[PDB]
Design a binder for this molecule. Structure first.
Ligand code: PLM
Ligand code: PLM
Ligand code: PLM
Lengths: 250, 272, 58, 238, 272, 58, 50, 21, 272, 21, 58
């Protein structure tokens, strides 16, 4: 019924039988730049199916005690095949993203997570008079982990979950496009995120357009004898990718 | 206009329709209104939503910054300077940070006041003071002294004002490099990510310089200038959660971990 | 060459004029008005339309 | 020149006004607009978006994720109380920092109806029923389900649909209520009681949580702007 | 227009009509005019009733309140504050209390003056003072010190003014919770009737805060601010008997029992 | 876009103009005018109409 | 200038007893304290003519 | 004469403006 | 309007056309645009060139000169004078010298300030000062004393101003002998080439005289007047290379030999 | 009254001008 | 007898009035406007016209 969906992009298809309706940006479906809104003069590269296919990020295990996980996108996909190579070879680029987050469990398991995509998710440092390290902010496809308590270190991210890493209430993250995975309701959630910026195109290494956060508001809980290994896996595909400024690779 | 939705009368219902139940997991709000849960009367609600508009929320002149300068000092060091930075002020910063991106014109007002310093000098009667405020864009000549040629101001805009007149006022058009000002920047200045990280990488909005344009007088005077900002014609995009932590720095978003609400005795307690 | 528009008044109980004196639009006073709202982009960002009276699932 | 007279109020600086003024940069070319998604024209577009309510405000749970969870369980007795709080959106610890509260904290007066969404987050094999109810002022909060049920209420059947919405109607002697706590514009009370027990099969955890979300109805507004008491500084930030 | 009724000529009458007699008990006034009691001439009375209109009666700027503050003090305690209360002033209160309910806009004017305090300091020559008046609605941040961040005023309306300029002026639109302001309230704040009783239960109109925005100078100064109120566009309902007792409190209607008129020697005495 | 109306004058022996300069009706000057009166609601609040020339009773 | 630009003023309601002019009050009668004997001023007797 | 009110910014000298004289 | 040229899409090219090569020797620039060298996309470039117009470049009020005078002195020697000369100021001169010829009206603004001199006098309280600025065209009567009849000003234009008022302002129409003002003059005043050489041979624009119009007071005062120039309606011809050497004299173009650029380690170095 | 702003040059006496009085 | 013209605005998202108060054109405010450009007199001062796509010589 409306619980079943299938998405085909490039050479990859994801079929889901128990899912939420698809959340779409701020009501905007991703498109290519118009002549009216353009900067760079060179004819852009449009890899089409070469990069618009789905890629899978490293899976994580959901513990009953887990505080949550996050990824930054332009960085997360930097080694993802040709998407990766096209950003490694260009000064400017643009793409939207389809984010499909999966976590199946038996009917006897309970818990619930927020799946949210947040633009410009600039991070605060655990040490006040300092800035966070590059590896504390992103590890490519490896998720970073939120802390259950206040954390510390000179280049550490203040990862305490309750402030979402940025000094806001975690409970107010629902402003941003989001969807929930409630184990009694569905196995997956889908968010479509258009490119959002102050500029038509940007440098894909210096700036992370958005961060994906997975936050367990209701921790995983189960009876004994039930399966103890319950993974969360994330699969993403760029859309309408465009590149400008072909150059010596970085 | 911008009138609040009114209320439609609603009688008893016995049917298969289920406005009461939904799926929050889907990422949208319920559209349920009182007519769907209880019997209602018609209400011609004439209330408007004008104060909720973005323009009204932001168009107030906030104090952003203030500094001081004196009419006496060492080797011409009698001027104040301030790097434009709207993040040094807690209340305005908070309001502005509600939107990720914004495009607006900015109206400025200055309030200039002064006072006497403790002195042993008799005969301090002095003429009315006139002040000069000059804006130097990035890369312009810089004052190093109050009597420097850098104050000639052949191109750089500036304002001269005499005490007792209405406070100075001026309009600044939207000036970004991009199509909006960013409130947040999840990135680095450099490609090797070795420069600073965060919003301050985009802050290259110039500096104000301020001084008296009178000569010195034996009676020492200290002056204070308050700079006020009033955004106009403001269009905003992508709202964000308001901050719960108190601000620590103007150059970043570092924060002290903070709880989400004041506590109470129990979950059923009325005394919050 | 002034324009004429209305003042905000209370509902369920008037014009004023406005001339621009500057060559730069940045000099104009704030664009305060009722405008319009479209909350659906934030409250209903969903591809498949939900019906208020219907079950969300199936 | 034209004879004129100055009125009172001349040469004053009002922080809340509308006047024209000279440009610092005549004929300045302003960078063109682009279609950035997510344009906000009005704050109600935000107030109508829900957020999760930190209902469990046990003092020791304030800095935990647990603040957002309402505990429920299998009970040996009928009609026990699940939760409750007064309806004071601009003051109560339950609502003051939610998105609706954060916007209201910049206003002095407010009016309109409110929605509360309750999402069951227990196992799929778990079922039960709850009473969601609002009791207008003139009596204190209900002390038993029997009393609670005499107000405005919804019986929430936990089944396939995971969420249920309690709509709080506008009931006031006034057109507007104060944002701040006030005795005259008393809010009334919102409570929840068990209707039935939470029933689970063997080898299922009976202990489970419910999340509550809050947002404004289409009929909602505010009257005048104020600063907010939620932020403070001692000196300029550097 | 609003012309007084004129007079119709009236000749001798001999009839059964009895305009002279009535029944006061019925609760209405007699409509008898001179033409009904004596022979009259025609009079084209051109007098109007304009000054009797409610708008003219009330639209005058009354002093409501005044207070003071100094340019020196202890630990930042150099500001004045005043809770809005229109009942602290005897003349205005009396006029306003004539109507049970009223709906109006209010125009405010401030008059700011200052003087020197006795001092032993020589060299007191000082720059012109500028003052800040800020309004804080119920629940806003509150100043505790003259240099508190609470004075940033990002949203709260405020006025800055320099001495020698025309006195400050501003318009406040009707702001009640209900559809009229009540002058009287025969009731309690609480349902158990344990709070206060009377009109003060509705008074939650915010507070004004006032201070100098100059820095301090060795010569001590004390300033006084008078706040004036001028209601406009005033619609009123349900007139009441004017008070005979003198007011005792701003928060209530307690009174000293008072007679109804000055006495005299006898009921036929001409010397009152 | 000013309106033109009359000045109060003495009876039995003139126009002025009025432009609004603000976007808020609260900014307008006082509505002083002759209006109208209807004292009957306070002087004759009676269901059964009395005739001036007639006895009040019967 | 308004302190609160574009302020939404609470709607009117038809409160009975509207007064447009003070003569609407002056034309309403009251009882005259005719008996102003000095010792009767604080008594109800002030209104009685014996 | 015509009633007027002076706004903020009166009697100021801006080096970047357009007025008649 | 004054819109920048837009960009036309351009596909692959294989032809005899050679937009890439030219002959610089011919004295004209290449007209090559990106569409001629690389494949391009269409770009609707909406940028304008308004700030590049000559009028905007020059119409700013620059300080040109300032001088001083006192309220006490010897034998009436209490006035300042200044020969009009726009070459005494480095920033304005530089901008003006970019065009060989120019025709414009000039708007002047004066900024007048004053201060106290060190003194042993008590009782220096004084009335507000008023200043007189007078222009004397070449050949007019000249002040020799502050009380000279030369200040009667029956024809010569002058401005009187009181401190505390807005700074003085006045418009001067284009006044050249020729049809444009020359910025440069490669010639001599005399036919035998025995007079001066260069631009100063044309400078016969008159002198300003300035003084107080109060009488003297025991408390000594020194005043400073800054004169500002804002060209308007400016038409220019024949642009010139901007100067690299620093100015030495107002009366000529003598210069200190100067290099053409800051150096660097090598021709391939990125660190300039 | 009508909002106005004073420009530079206010309240100055020019010996060469044209105004009504 | 004021003229009405436009304000400069941003491209790819208004009138103002201008009256002269003086008898001398020197009293008018600056003639700021877009005007027009003709760079060819400085960039292509050549008798024999060059074609962009062609060799400069022969
Ligand atoms: C001396 C008179 C001229 C004054 C000119 C001052 C111009 C300073 C720049 C103001 C705009 C700053 C906008 C910052 C907004 C942001 O980045 O979030
Ligand atoms: C600092 C400038 C802004 C001033 C804002 C002050 C607004 C205070 C409220 C005034 C209205 C009070 C009406 C009371 C009438 C009544 O209840 O009978
Ligand atoms: C006292 C009031 C009147 C002031 C009159 C001052 C007129 C001085 C002449 C100004 C024009 C000078 C133009 C020089 C330009 C050039 O040669 O390059």
């Amino acid at each position: 019924s409306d619980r079943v969906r299938s998405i085909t992009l490039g050479n990859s298809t994801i079929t889901t039988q128990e899912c939420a309706n698809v959340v779409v940006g701020y009501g905007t479906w991703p498109t290519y730049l118009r002549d009216e809104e353009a900067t760079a003069e060179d004819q852009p590269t449009q890899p089409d199916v070469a990069t618009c296919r789905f890629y899978t990020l490293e899976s994580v295990m959901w513990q009953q005690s887990s505080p949550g996980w996050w990824w930054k996108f332009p960085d997360a996909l930097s080694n993802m095949g040709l998407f990766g190579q096209n950003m490694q070879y260009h000064y400017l680029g643009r793409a939207g993203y389809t984010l499909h987050v999966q976590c199946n469990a038996s009917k006897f398991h309970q818990g619930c997570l927020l799946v949210v995509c947040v633009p410009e998710a600039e991070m605060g440092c655990a040490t006040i008079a300092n800035k966070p390290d590059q590896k504390s902010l992103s590890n490519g496809e490896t998720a970073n982990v939120f802390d259950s308590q206040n954390t510390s270190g000179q280049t550490a991210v203040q990862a305490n979950v309750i402030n979402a890493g940025m000094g806001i209430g975690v409970g107010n993250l629902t402003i941003f496009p989001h969807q929930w995975i409630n184990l009694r309701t569905n196995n997956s959630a889908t968010i479509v995120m258009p490119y959002v910026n102050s500029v038509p195109m940007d440098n894909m290494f210096r700036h992370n357009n958005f961060t994906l956060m997975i936050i367990p508001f209701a921790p995983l809980s189960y009876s004994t004898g039930a399966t103890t290994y319950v993974p969360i896996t994330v699969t993403v595909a760029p859309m309408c990718a465009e590149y400008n400024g072909l150059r010596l690779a970085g | 206009i911008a009138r609040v939705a009114d209320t439609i009368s609603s009688g008893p219902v016995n049917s298969e329709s289920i406005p009461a139940l939904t799926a929050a997991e889907t990422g949208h709000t319920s559209q349920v209104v009182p007519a769907d849960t209880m019997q209602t009367r018609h209400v011609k609600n004439y209330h408007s939503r004008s104060e909720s508009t973005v323009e009204n929320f932001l168009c107030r002149s906030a104090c952003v910054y203030y500094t001081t300068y004196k009419n006496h000092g060492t080797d011409g060091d009698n001027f104040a300077q301030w790097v434009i930075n709207t993040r040094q002020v807690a209340q305005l910063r908070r309001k502005l940070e509600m939107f990720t991106y914004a495009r607006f014109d900015l109206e400025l007002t200055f309030v200039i006041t002064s006072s006497q310093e403790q002195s042993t000098i008799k005969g301090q009667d002095s003429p009315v003071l006139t002040h000069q405020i000059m804006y130097v864009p990035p890369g312009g000549p810089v004052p190093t002294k109050i009597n420097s040629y850098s104050w000639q101001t052949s191109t750089n805009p500036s304002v001269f004002w005499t005490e007792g007149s209405a406070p100075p006022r001026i309009s600044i058009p939207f000036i970004s490099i991009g199509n909006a000002y960013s409130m947040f920047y999840d990135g680095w200045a450099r490609f090797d990510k070795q420069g600073t990280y965060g919003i301050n990488t985009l802050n290259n909005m110039g500096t104000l310089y301020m001084r008296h344009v009178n000569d010195g007088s034996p009676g020492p005077i200290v002056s204070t200038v308050r700079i006020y900002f009033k955004p106009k014609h403001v269009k905003t995009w992508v709202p964000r959660p308001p901050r719960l932590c108190q601000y620590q720095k103007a150059g970043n978003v570092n924060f002290e971990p903070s709880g989400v609400t004041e506590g109470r005795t129990e979950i059923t307690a009325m005394q919050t | 060459g002034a324009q004429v528009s209305t003042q905000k008044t209370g509902a369920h109980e008037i014009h004023y004029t406005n001339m621009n004196y500057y060559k730069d639009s940045a000099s104009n006073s704030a664009n305060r008005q009722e405008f319009a709202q479209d909350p659906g982009k934030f409250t209903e960002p969903v591809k498949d339309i939900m019906i208020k009276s219907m079950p969300a699932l199936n | 020149g034209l004879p004129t007279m100055l009125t009172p109020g001349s040469n004053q600086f009002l922080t809340s006004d509308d006047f024209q003024s000279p440009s610092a940069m005549p004929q300045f070319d302003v960078t063109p607009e682009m279609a950035i998604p997510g344009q906000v024209n009005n704050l109600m577009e935000i107030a109508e978006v829900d957020s999760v309510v930190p209902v469990n405000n046990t003092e020791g749970k304030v800095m935990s994720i647990e603040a957002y969870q309402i505990p429920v369980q299998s009970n040996s007795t009928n009609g026990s109380q699940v939760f409750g709080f007064p309806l004071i959106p601009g003051a109560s610890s339950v609502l003051n920092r939610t998105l609706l509260g954060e916007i209201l904290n910049y206003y002095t007066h407010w009016s309109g109806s409110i929605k509360l969404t309750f999402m069951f987050c227990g196992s799929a094999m778990a079922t039960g029923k709850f009473l969601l109810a609002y009791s207008p002022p003139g009596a204190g909060a209900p002390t038993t389900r029997k009393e609670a049920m005499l107000g405005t209420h919804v019986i929430w059947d936990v089944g396939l649909q995971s969420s249920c919405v309690l709509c709080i109607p506008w009931i006031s002697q006034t057109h507007y209520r104060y944002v701040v706590m006030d005795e005259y514009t008393a809010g009334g009370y919102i409570t929840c009681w068990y209707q039935t027990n939470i029933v689970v099969p063997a080898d299922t955890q009976s202990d489970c949580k419910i999340l509550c979300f809050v947002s404004a109805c289409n009929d909602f507004s505010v009257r005048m702007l104020k600063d907010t008491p939620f932020i403070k500084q001692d000196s300029f930030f550097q």
